[PDB]
Each structure stands twice: as C-alpha cells, then as structure tokens.
C-alpha cells in the first residue's frame, strides 16, 4: 500500500 | 528468503499535449502488482497479479485517491522544477521516484529507499538513517528545506518502519505460493563454430524467478569477465527471466570452459560443459 | 542526457517450427521514457502486441516488454523495429533464434 506523505518538491 | 516492496512513480511534461501524464507501479520482489495512469480512459488503480484481487473496495478507493492526489502534487512539482532549473516552458521533463522496504531473511526491516531523479539525475534521496537528506545540488536544497519544515523525514520513517513493512508482510503472506516460490534456471550450454578457428559457447539459463541471478564462465578454472558477453537480465512474460553469457573459444579448447550458475532456487550451485 | 535503449529479441519458450509461441521485444536502458516499439513479421508490422507498464530500474532508466503470439517456421522472419529520440533513424533487430 502507497505511503500518503505527500508534498510538493 | 529476502524481500522487498517498491513504488515506483514517473511524472512526464508535454508541453502543448496536454498536463504531464503520472504513472505509479507496485512491486513485491520482481513482480508488479498494481498499476495507476492518469492517461487511462477511466483513471483507477488496477491489480496487476492475483494475489491482491482479494482486497476490498475501500483498498482500491483509497489507493485511487493516493495516485489521484499524486497525479496533482507531482504536476505542481514539475512546475516548480523547472523554476528552480531556469528551464524554459517549451521543453519535456521527467520527475520520478521510488521507495519501499527491504525485508531480511526473519521478515524484519533490512533497510528503507524514499529517492527522487529530475531528468534521470539523482536529485534528492532519503538518507539511510530515514532522518536526513541528500541533495545533489541547490536546486534540490529548495526541495528539502521544504521537506525539513513539513518533516517529511519523520512520517517516511513511520511509514517505512511501519504500514510499508506490515503490508509486505499481508502481500507475502497471500501470494506465498508464487512470491515465496523461487524456480531455479533451466540451463543448458549451445556452441555455434564462428570460423574454422573458433566457437562460440552460450550458457543459458531460462525459467527463473527471481530475477537475481549470476552467471560466469570459468577457462581452467579462472573468471572470464573481460572475454565474456552477459546479455541483461530479460523477462519471458511469464514472471519467469532469461540470461545467456558466452565466451568465444580456440576449436578444440571447448572442455577447458565451464560455466557457473548461482540462483536461489537451485539446491546447488551449477557447472556446466559443452556436452557434444 | 539522454540514453539511447538497448534490444532484445526473443522468444518466451524455446522456438520450435509449427509450434505457438510468443515474440518478446525488450527494450531498456533508455531516457526519456517515449519510445515507439513494433513488432514485425517479414518486414510488416504486427496488429494488437501488447505491453508492459512503464518502469524503471535503479540507475532511473526505463524498460518495456512488448509482446506478441506467435508460431515461427524456418523461413518466416520476425524482427522489432525502434524508435526513440535518441536515433536518427529506428532501428531494426532481427529475431535469431541462438540469442
């Protein structure tokens, strides 16, 4: 399963 | 024995062909599982093996909302990438990543992979010790003050050490029968004269899962690296690979060449001869 | 910066005349990801090959599978004909059943 720790570069 | 769980995702730039297309696969081992692509006609995360067919609905909204949140973040990223590059708007960039878990023998965390690559260069990876950065120049230093303030680090650590290493685990559980299956090459050795004076000898090895394998031929018992032609690793299409190496050889000399198979599946490494 | 793609040509199982197979066109190594693969049989292009997703490989380069059934025989001739920024022209490779 994906991570969700998502975040602009 | 060992094992391992990788995304991998690609954002690409099109400059008057629409938004940049976002493509995310998974991996457990050598074999995909899933895949999302924000160019499909319905984009929807999809199951790649059967395995992961058994999990429920709310397992594929949530990993559509995942890819669908990435699809936007890494449009953004693009964006700003080619900011930070002083990079016109005319040209194609790529921007991709992977990370995931590596699992030693026991089942415990061997170690942990969060890297990201602008244009195929390396731009900024996750450090071992999961708590620091690496940076691969001053355009990636903007990416990871970012980071550092949202403490990005702290939650891959998290999901790392955490969700990354249990989900492995549930996905080599319900898959045992091929994930935790490894078949041994299949191999044989061809000779093929190239001229009156020489042969080529080809040992294959065909069939095999993993794809980790080595393969070397030996003349009176001494490496042959710098003589021999090792083809990639190739897969069949059928989860199974295929590799050759050959050795082009003096006629008459072919019984001072063995070649030597090393594969998890096998009870034994090999040796093998050209068997006229 | 960019990185032209390496070929293979082969078949899944060991090639046997009259005997239904599959015809394998690897490429990879290459970057950027766009590239145009066909398959074909004595120079004509092959209709519905099929293909792997996009991925890649630690050093960040790409690679695909594209594939297809086949039966080969003595005289037909397959081959995969490439096409990527990087050349100038495609670029063919022939299936010889030794490699």
Same mark, same amino acid.
């Given at each position: 399963?994906?991570?969700?720790?998502?975040?602009?570069? | 024995? /060992?094992?391992?769980?990788?995304?991998?995702?690609?954002?690409?730039?099109?400059?008057?062909?629409?938004?940049?297309?976002?493509? *995310?696969? @998974?991996?457990?081992?050598?074999?995909?599982?899933?895949?999302?692509?924000?160019?499909?006609?319905?984009?929807?995360?999809?199951?790649?093996?059967?395995?992961?067919?058994?999990?429920?609905?709310?397992?594929?909204?949530?990993?559509?909302?995942?890819?669908?949140?990435?699809?936007?973040? $890494?449009?953004?990223?693009?964006?700003?990438?080619?900011? $930070?590059?002083?990079?016109?708007? !005319?040209? /194609?960039?790529?921007?991709?990543?992977?990370?995931? =878990?590596?699992?030693?023998?026991?089942?415990?965390?061997?170690? @942990?992979?969060?890297?990201?690559?602008?244009?195929?260069?390396? $731009?900024?990876?996750?450090?071992?010790?999961?708590?620091?950065?690496?940076?691969?120049?001053?355009? !990636?230093?903007?990416?990871?003050?970012?980071?550092? *303030?949202?403490?990005?680090?702290?939650?891959?650590?998290?999901?790392?050490?955490?969700? =990354?290493?249990?989900?492995?685990?549930?996905?080599?559980?319900?898959?045992?029968?091929?994930?935790?299956? *490894?078949?041994?090459?299949?191999?044989?050795?061809?000779?093929?004269?190239?001229?009156?004076?020489?042969?080529?000898?080809? =040992?294959?090895?065909?069939?095999? $899962?993993?794809?980790?394998?080595?393969?070397?031929?030996?003349?009176? @018992?001494?490496?042959?690296?710098?003589?021999?032609?090792?083809?990639?690793?190739?897969?069949? @299409?059928?989860?199974?690979?295929?590799?050759?190496? *050959?050795?082009?050889?003096?006629?008459?000399?072919?019984?001072?060449?063995? =070649?030597?198979?090393?594969?998890?599946?096998?009870?034994?490494?090999?040796?093998?001869?050209?068997?006229? | 910066?960019?990185?032209?793609?390496?070929?293979?040509?082969?078949?899944?199982?060991?090639?046997?005349?009259?005997?239904?197979?599959?015809?394998?066109?690897?490429?990879?190594?290459?970057?950027?990801?766009?590239?145009?693969?066909?398959?074909? %049989?004595?120079?004509?292009?092959?209709? %519905?090959?099929?293909?792997?997703?996009?991925?890649?490989? %630690?050093?960040?380069?790409?690679?695909?599978?594209?594939?297809?059934?086949?039966?080969?025989?003595?005289?037909?001739?397959?081959?995969?004909?490439?096409?990527?920024?990087?050349?100038?022209?495609?670029?063919?490779?022939?299936?010889?059943?030794?490699?």
């Amino acid at each position: 399963n994906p991570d969700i720790v998502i975040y602009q570069y | 024995g /060992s094992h391992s769980m990788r995304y991998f995702y690609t954002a690409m730039s099109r400059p008057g062909r629409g938004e940049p297309r976002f493509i *995310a696969v @998974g991996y457990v081992d050598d074999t995909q599982f899933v895949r999302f692509d924000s160019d499909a006609a319905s984009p929807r995360t999809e199951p790649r093996a059967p395995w992961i067919e058994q999990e429920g609905p709310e397992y594929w909204d949530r990993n559509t909302q995942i890819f669908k949140t990435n699809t936007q973040t $890494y449009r953004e990223s693009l964006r700003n990438l080619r900011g $930070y590059y002083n990079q016109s708007e !005319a040209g /194609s960039h790529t921007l991709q990543s992977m990370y995931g =878990c590596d699992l030693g023998p026991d089942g415990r965390l061997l170690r @942990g992979h969060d890297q990201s690559a602008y244009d195929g260069k390396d $731009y900024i990876a996750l450090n071992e010790d999961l708590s620091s950065w690496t940076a691969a120049d001053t355009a !990636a230093q903007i990416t990871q003050r970012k980071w550092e *303030a949202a403490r990005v680090a702290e939650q891959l650590r998290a999901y790392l050490e955490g969700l =990354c290493v249990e989900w492995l685990r549930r996905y080599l559980e319900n898959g045992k029968e091929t994930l935790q299956r *490894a078949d041994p090459p299949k191999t044989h050795v061809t000779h093929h004269p190239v001229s009156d004076h020489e042969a080529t000898l080809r =040992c294959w090895a065909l069939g095999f $899962y993993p794809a980790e394998i080595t393969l070397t031929w030996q003349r009176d @018992g001494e490496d042959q690296t710098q003589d021999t032609e090792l083809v990639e690793t190739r897969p069949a @299409g059928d989860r199974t690979f295929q590799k050759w190496a *050959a050795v082009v050889v003096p006629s008459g000399e072919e019984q001072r060449y063995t =070649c030597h198979v090393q594969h998890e599946g096998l009870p034994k490494p090999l040796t093998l001869r050209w068997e006229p | 910066i960019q990185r032209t793609p390496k070929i293979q040509v082969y078949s899944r199982h060991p090639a046997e005349n009259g005997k239904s197979n599959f015809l394998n066109c690897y490429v990879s190594g290459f970057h950027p990801s766009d590239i145009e693969v066909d398959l074909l %049989k004595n120079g004509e292009r092959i209709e %519905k090959v099929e293909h792997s997703d996009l991925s890649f490989s %630690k050093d960040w380069s790409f690679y695909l599978l594209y594939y297809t059934e086949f039966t080969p025989t003595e005289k037909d001739e397959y081959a995969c004909r490439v096409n990527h920024v990087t050349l100038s022209q495609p670029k063919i490779v022939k299936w010889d059943r030794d490699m």
